[PDB]
Every structure is written in structure tokens, then in C-alpha cells.
Design a binder for this molecule. Structure first.
Ligand SMILES: COC(=O)c1cc(-c2cc(-c3ncc(CN4CCN(C(C)C)CC4)o3)c3c[nH]nc3c2)cnc1OC
Length: 863
């Protein structure tokens, strides 16, 4: 049909890769992935189009609740009915539930319209005016993020009564169209030749080859003979490994590194020994290599798509048997693993086992004790599953079958444990399957929190069709916000050759599951394409004329019909709940920094003040580290709020959308410390002493009794960011990358460097901020020590969730961020949270660092 052709061309444009390219590979693994995932996503779409109207509100507008509310006071609210020019303003309590507010709005309508209504409060939901956000369910108004926000900023919540028939019309309009174990001989390969090799002709070419199960060697590495450097080297030699063909585990990867010797790294390539249908690979393989920036076991197991320029290694996998050989089925593995001797051990060694399972590297004897006592690990210490998997000999089929037998009856583990099991340190497919099974209980809020890490984990997958891909696709099709962010994390990496195929395939599958969301995302892509062209113009014009001239030309370009159309009426890529309605051209500008980022403002008559939102478009810088830093700060905020600690943080949106391209959220009514300290004349903040500048500026935005609250917001947020930058090792902090809101809230921007990348970033206490905390007084120990108490409380809360931060950062090593690429980076976090200590030892150590920072601050106070 014409529609099928149209959807295919629309998916090709959205994902940034023509669907015909997938067909041209003539790859049965790619073909099977496309078929099975299309069917799976089409089933999810059919389940969706028939949801009840409240279930469809949960899909499209998942509730945004306060972290404390997950798992009294007078309040003024403005309520109108859909398509009404008339609204009603009434008093409710923060403890009241949406239904009581709805019943109240219905009584007011019945009185004003002089008729007894047919409608009951149960037939409606409350939309947040001009936003894709709703208040529904049995939660008090204060438990909703929107009301909580209105309450702290003093503003009046504006809501719209939306009838179930209107929600159903949305549902309807948004519808998709109508045996191995006998093979004892050592594993071996034939290294035939190399093609398109480039290196110094004075050198020799060597091929280092290794067998791996994740990062662990299955046997020692084997190297070729040294052959003269030339474009087409010829080895035609046998490389025999110290492992039997029967002992190769299911996820065994064969890793290669081509290099030059007088070391000079040239290229690397990896491949799985068994294909996607569990068959042991035989025959010739031409491996298109990746250039080395020597073995790379974590590297992708798919060849370099750039066959024209890539170095190629031709290898031969020998026919081990006259018939095809498959990895044994689970029932065959369970039969072998079912037999084994159960460990009977003394109370003295039982004390030692409990000591090492609760304790982290182990000694060789401590490993044998864990392995011998594996049944006791399962029955009494099930959370120690990861330790047991790390002592298992993955290069011995009987040990693997015994481990697999126990795993197949292992109790489901907490989400924290399951996160650890997704690391490349647990490469087995059954371990991966078990980790997903324990993650199915993740709430949509917890999943959204860890989505960025789960997407990075995809880069560790050995095959296209995997449990993690299906898990992420099913959760994305069941929650529109999850779907939104899954698409953007995949899309923003389509320029990376190693992931373009996998990521391209997942995005096609998602689009099959939601035709309407594909068109919504295409409209975002159209706006981003215009912003790129607009930004290129600005970068050029900025080197030739004055800012007033570049700014006027920018506005003229935005006022073109194609730009007004493409830049208006879209869901924000930073937050699909935020609607970017009318682009306010007069308010748009660009920033004076290197990449000249665009500052784009929007307004919405339907949303009132809440509709006044902006986005910063930046091109030329990689935004992945900023996003990760901000998500870690947002996680800290959630963890603190769960302990009743609100440090008034500003975790603003930051989202990579393409190659060195992305969006950053505009925080209105905010300015940098540097701009405020310029201490300009004929201003309400002009100071007698530059130290008075921040406090005068706060005084001008908060007259009378409001000043005390602004100083309190400043103190709380300063404690949060002092702790956050210390734990994350955020250095290069100055007056131009620290901002303050009119409310008093301090926040950081532009997170270029973290994890002390290499020197230990000390705790930072700046005098200018000590001056506001102390209310402009030289000595105010009462206020300064309340601030120290907020720092200590914030730090001790984070420490308790230390393992969560460690598991998440470990998953992030897959991202390929230069500041997060080894054990040394994770070690930094281990030191900053001082996790190898008691809470008393860590707090004493934190106080030493905090006191070391105040002495450093005093070298400015004495001046
Ligand atoms: C240097 O630029 C970047 O590369 C960058 C910027 C931000 C940022 C800045 C402001 C911000 N800078 C200065 C201001 C204050 N002025 C803004 C323009 N106003 C005019 C148009 C009236 C005057 C006040 O703000 C951010 C503000 N919200 N979010 C920001 C992110 C975040 N990450 C960044 O890189 C990752």
C-alpha cells in the first residue's frame, strides 16, 4: 500500500538511515531481528489502541510525582473546562485529592450554568494548562510535582477539566494504520592474510590473538610470527589455544590485534565463536578491522562497515566435525549441572565464608571456598550471586553447567543487584537473562532514572536480538516518555559506525509500534535541522559583523515561513511534557561563547506564564558528559528528597540529539555569578564593596521578608552543589559557570570535567558564597554551621547509596567517554564517598576536607 511506502520513507528520514541499507546487507541476523521485533512492537500497539481512558493517560502522560510520594495547608487553584473562556478560582487543601477538586469544579459549573449535571468527577482528569501533564489518581495535590512547584514559587496552579470522551478521541486519533562436549581437541584457527594494511616499512607486522569471556582470558594469548610490513601480509599459519573446543563457553569471543614491531598499534577486530542461532562457526571469515586509538575484548563483535578504507584480516575457522555443532540446550546443561557434591564445612570456615560474602578482590584459597560452598551461597546469601559468578571457571564446561544449574533456581534479586549483573564482567547470556528478570520490577520512574545506562549496556551485547532490547522496547511502547528518551539516546549516536546498525534497527522497531509518535519525533527533528542551519549562519556572521547585526539577521531568517513553521508547535526534546508553542523571535539570541549557541524563546497563550520557556541549541561540542553529570545530580536530589532533604537543586535538561549537537534547558530569572559581580553602575544591586554584590542583587529580587527565604534557598542549594561537585570531582569551577536564580537558588552549568580528570579535586568553599550564607555578617557561626550540617547530611545520604552510583558509573564505561574509560575513574568515586570505611571514619575524613576548604576560603576572608 501507499501508506506502507510512506511510513518506510518517514522512518528512514527520522532515524537518519535508509531502510534499504538494512536489506542490502543480506544478513539473516538483521532480517530475523527486523521480523521478530516488528511483530513484538505491532502487538504492543494493538494492546495500546484498546486501553481504557485512564490507562491511556498512564501511557501518554505518566504521573510526575514528588520522590517522597512514590511507593494541612491552604491552596488557591484556577480550574477551567476544555474549550471554555471562563475559569473558576477556589481554595482547596494540599492534602485534597484531584477528585475533590474536580467535584468542586463540577458543582461550580452546575450552579453557574443553572442545570444539574449528568457528569461525575470520576469521568474527568485535570490537565496542567497548555502542557502534556495531568493530575489524576488517589494522591494528595502536594504529592504532584506541578503543585509542589507552584507551592514553593508561590504561583497559582492553573488546571483544565478534561472529559474521558476527549481523552478517548486522543487515543483514537493517535492510532497506527489498519555434541560440543565430545570435541576434546585444542581450539585453533588459521591466520591466512591481511589486506589494506598501513604501517612503517622499516617494521614487522604481528597479530596477537586471545579468547575471552567478557574481559577475562579463557587461556593465554597466542601471537603470530613476525612478517615484513606491507599492504597485503601473508601468514597462512595455525594458531592453537590452550582450551579444548568442548570448554568454549556460549559467549566466547575471539579477539585480534594487528600491530607493528621494531609497539605500534594498528587495528583490532573481535568475533563471537557461536552465531546468533547457537551454531559453532566454521569456514573463512574476512574481519574488517577497527583502527586502534593491545587486545580490546569489550569492543564490538561486528566488522567495520567502512570496507573501502579498513584493514582486513582473513582467518579460517576449522570444521571440527563433519556435521554442524550447536551449543547444548538448557535441558542438556541442567542434566550435567544437576550432579555435584554439596559442601559440608566447619563453623570456623562458615564464619570466614560469611566474612568474605558480606565484604572487593579475593585470594585464590578464598575463591575455592566460595566455589565449594556455592549451594550455601544460593540458599543463605543469594545477593552474593555476582561474587559466585566471578569465581566460576568459565573455561571449564562442567563448572559452567554447575553454575548454570544454581542460577536457574536462584531467587529474584533486588534492582541494585540486577544493575551490577548487567556489567560486561557478567557476559554469560543466562546471567544477562536473569538480570533482566530481576529488573522487570523497576517502576517507570526508576527505569527513566537508569535509562541512559541501560542504553549504554546495548553496546556490550553480542547479538542484535537480546532480552535487554526487548525489555527496553516493551517498556518504551508502554510509556510515551520512556519511548521519547529511548529514541533520542539511540538517535543521538547514529553518526557512530559501531552502533548505527543496532541503534537504527531498534528505532525502526519502535516506529512500527507507534506511527503517531514517529510523526511527533519527526517534527522535533525538523526543528533541530532548522536550528542547525540557523546556528551555522550565526557562527559565520559572528566573525564578520556586530552582535546587533548578526542578531537582526538571525531574526530575519527565523521570520521565514519555513522557519516559523518548523520551529513552532512541537514537544520539547528535553521534556515531552513541555510544549514549545509560538517561537518569540524578538526574544531569541545567541551566546558569546565559542560555538555561538542559540537562545530560543517560546510563549503559549494557553499555558500563561508556564508557557514562557526556552531552549539552548548547541553544535560543535559533545554534550554526553554534561547530561551524565546532570542526571547524577538529579539522582542525588531524588535520594536526598527520599530522606526528607530538599536542597533546592536545579537539575536542568541537557540532551544530545545528534553528532556534537544537543539542547540545554533555559532557566529563566537567572544569571551567572560573574555577571552579577560585574557590579554595573545605575543598577538596584550596585555595591560599596564587591563582596556585597550577590547579596544586594538578592535583596533587589526579594524585598522585605522575602530576603530571608532567598538566603535559605541559597544556603541549601550551595550545600547540595558543594557536595555534588566534590563527590563527582567537578573542577574548573568559576564565577562564569555558577548561576543564581532570583529565588536565591545557586546552580552549576557547563560540566566539562569530572572524576578529577588526573588530580584529586578538593572540597571547595568560596568566600563570596560564605558571605551570603552568613547574611553579609563577618561572623555568623549559627548560619555557617547550619550550612555545614546540610553538607554533612547530604554527603552521608549519598554514601549510603554509594553502590548505586558505583554500579551506574560502571555501566557508563560502555559510553566511551574519555574521562570515564578505566578502573581509575571509578576509584575516584570510591575515594570521594570513602566507601572502604565506617560512617564515623568517612564523616571524620569529610570534616577534614571541609575544614581544609574553609582554611583555603579564609585566604580570601583575611583580604
Ligand atoms: C558556555 O555555553 C555553553 O556551552 C553552555 C551553557 C549552559 C547554560 C548557560 C546559561 C547561561 N549563561 C549565561 C546566562 C545568563 N544570561 C542568559 C541570556 N539572557 C538574555 C538572553 C536575556 C541574559 C542572562 O545563562 C543558562 C541559562 N539557563 N540554562 C543555561 C545553560 C550550559 N551548558 C553549556 O555547555 C554544555
Amino acid at each position: 500500500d501507499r501508506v506502507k511506502k510512506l511510513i518506510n520513507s518517514q522512518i528512514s528520514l527520522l532515524i537518519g538511515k535508509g531502510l534499504h541499507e538494512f536489506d542490502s546487507l543480506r544478513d539473516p541476523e538483521v532480517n530475523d531481528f527486523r521480523t521478530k521485533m516488528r511483530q513484538f512492537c505491532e502487538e504492543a500497539a494493538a494492546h495500546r489502541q484498546q486501553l481504557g481512558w485512564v490507562e491511556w493517560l498512564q501511557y501518554s502522560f505518566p504521573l510526575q510525582l514528588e520522590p517522597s510520594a512514590r511507593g494541612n495547608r491552604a491552596l488557591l487553584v484556577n480550574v477551567k473546562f476544555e474549550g471554555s473562556e471562563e475559569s473558576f478560582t477556589f481554595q482547596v487543601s494540599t492534602k485534597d485529592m484531584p477528585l475533590a477538586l474536580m467535584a468542586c469544579a463540577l458543582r461550580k459549573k452546575a450552579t453557574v450554568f443553572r442545570q444539574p449535571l449528568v457528569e461525575q468527577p470520576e469521568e474527568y482528569a485535570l490537565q496542567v494548562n497548555g502542557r502534556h501533564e495531568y493530575l489524576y489518581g488517589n494522591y494528595p495535590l502536594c504529592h504532584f510535582q506541578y503543585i509542589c512547584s507552584c507551592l514553593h514559587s508561590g504561583l497559582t496552579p492553573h488546571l483544565t477539566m478534561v472529559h474521558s470522551s476527549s481523552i478517548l478521541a486522543m487515543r483514537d486519533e493517535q492510532s497506527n494504520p489498519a555434541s560440543l562436549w565430545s570435541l576434546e581437541q585444542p581450539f585453533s584457527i588459521e591466520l591466512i592474510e591481511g589486506r589494506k594494511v598501513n604501517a612503517d616499512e622499516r617494521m614487522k607486522l604481528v597479530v596477537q590473538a586471545g579468547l575471552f569471556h567478557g574481559n577475562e582470558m579463557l587461556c593465554k594469548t597466542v601471537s603470530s610470527s613476525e612478517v615484513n610490513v606491507c599492504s597485503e601480509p601473508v601468514w597462512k599459519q595455525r594458531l592453537e589455544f590452550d582450551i579444548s573446543v568442548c570448554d568454549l563457553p556460549r559467549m566466547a569471543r575471539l579477539c585480534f590485534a594487528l600491530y607493528a614491531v621494531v609497539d605500534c598499534p594498528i587495528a583490532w577486530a573481535n568475533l563471537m565463536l557461536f552465531d546468533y542461532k547457537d551454531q559453532l562457526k566454521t569456514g573463512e571469515r574476512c574481519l574488517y578491522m577497527w583502527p586502534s586509538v593491545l587486545l580490546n575484548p569489550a569492543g564490538t563483535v561486528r566488522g567495520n562497515p567502512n570496507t573501502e578504507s579498513a584493514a582486513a584480516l582473513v582467518i579460517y575457522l576449522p570444521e571440527v566435525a563433519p556435521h554442524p555443532v550447536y551449543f547444548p540446550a538448557l535441558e542438556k546443561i541442567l542434566e550435567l549441572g544437576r550432579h555435584g557434591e554439596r559442601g559440608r564445612i566447619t563453623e570456623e570456615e562458615q564464619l570466614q565464608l560469611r566474612e568474605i560474602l558480606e565484604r572487593g578482590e579475593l585470594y585464590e584459597h578464598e575463591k575455592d571456598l566460595v566455589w565449594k560452598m556455592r549451594h550455601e551461597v544460593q540458599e543463605h546469601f543469594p545477593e552474593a550471586l555476582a561474587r559466585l559468578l566471578l569465581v566460576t571457571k568459565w573455561n571449564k564446561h562442567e563448572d559452567v553447567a554447575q553454575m548454570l544449574y544454581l542460577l536457574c533456581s536462584w531467587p529474584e534479586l533486588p534492582v541494585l543487584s540486577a544493575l551490577e549483573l548487567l556489567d560486561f564482567s557478567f557476559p554469560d547470556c543466562y546471567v544477562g537473562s536473569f538480570a533482566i528478570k530481576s529488573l522487570r520490577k523497576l517502576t517507570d520512574d526508576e527505569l527513566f532514572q537508569y535509562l541512559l545506562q541501560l542504553v549504554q549496556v546495548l553496546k556490550y551485547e553480542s547479538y542484535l536480538d537480546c532480552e535487554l532490547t526487548k525489555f527496553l522496547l516493551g517498556r518504551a511502547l508502554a510509556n510515551r516518555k520512556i519511548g521519547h528518551f529511548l529514541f533520542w539516546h539511540l538517535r543521538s549516536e547514529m553518526h557512530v559506525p559501531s552502533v548505527a546498525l543496532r541503534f537504527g534497527l531498534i528505532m525502526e522497531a519502535y516506529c512500527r509500534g507507534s506511527t503517531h509518535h514517529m510523526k511527533v519525533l519527526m517534527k522535533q527533528g525538523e526543528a533541530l535541522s532548522k536550528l542547525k542551519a540557523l546556528n551555522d549562519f550565526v557562527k559565520v556572521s559572528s566573525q564578520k559583523t556586530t552582535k546587533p547585526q548578526t542578531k537582526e539577521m538571525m531574526h530575519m531568517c527565523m521570520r521565514q515561513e519555513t522557519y516559523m513553521e518548523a520551529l513552532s508547535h512541537l514537544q520539547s526534546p528535553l521534556d515531552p511534557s513541555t510544549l514549545l508553542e509560538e517561537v518569540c523571535v524578538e526574544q531569541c539570541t545567541f551566546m558569546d561563547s565559542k560555538m555561538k549557541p542559540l537562545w530560543i524563546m517560546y510563549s503559549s497563550e494557553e499555558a500563561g506564564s508556564a508557557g514562557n520557556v526556552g531552549i539552548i541549541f548547541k553544535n560543535g561540542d559533545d554534550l554526553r558528559q554534561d547530561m551524565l553529570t546532570l542526571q547524577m545530580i538529579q539522582l542525588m536530589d531524588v535520594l536526598w528528597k527520599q530522606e526528607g532533604l530538599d536542597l533546592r537543586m536545579t537539575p536542568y535538561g541537557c540532551l544530545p540529539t545528534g553528532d556534537r549537537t544537543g539542547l540545554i534547558e533555559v532557566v529563566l530569572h537567572s544569571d551567572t555569578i560573574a555577571n552579577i559581580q560585574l557590579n554595573k553602575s545605575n543598577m538596584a544591586a550596585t555595591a560599596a564593596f564587591n563582596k556585597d554584590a550577590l547579596l544586594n542583587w538578592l535583596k533587589s529580587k526579594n524585598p522585605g521578608e522575602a530576603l530571608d527565604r532567598a538566603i535559605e534557598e541559597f544556603t541549601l542549594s550551595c550545600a547540595g552543589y558543594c557536595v555534588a561537585t566534590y563527590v563527582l570531582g567537578i573542577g574548573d569551577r568559576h564565577s562564569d559557570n555558577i548561576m543564581i536564580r532570583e529565588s536565591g537558588q545557586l546552580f552549576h552549568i557547563d560540566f566539562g570535567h569530572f572524576l578529577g580528570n588526573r588530580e584529586r579535586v578538593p572540597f571547595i568553599l568560596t568566600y563570596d558564597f560564605v558571605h551570603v550564607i552568613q547574611q553579609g555578617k563577618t561572623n555568623n557561626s549559627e548560619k555557617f554551621e547550619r550550612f555545614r550540617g546540610y553538607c554533612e547530611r547530604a554527603y552521608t545520604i549519598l554514601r549510603r547509596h554509594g553502590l548505586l552510583f558505583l554500579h551506574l558509573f560502571a555501566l557508563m564505561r560502555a559510553a566511551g567517554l574519555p574521562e570515564l574509560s578505566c578502573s581509575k575513574d571509578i576509584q575516584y568515586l570510591k575515594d570521594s564517598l570513602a566507601l572502604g570505611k565506617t560512617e564515623e571514619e568517612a564523616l571524620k575524613h569529610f570534616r577534614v576536607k571541609f575544614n581544609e576548604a574553609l582554611r583555603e576560603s579564609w585566604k580570601t576572608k583575611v583580604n
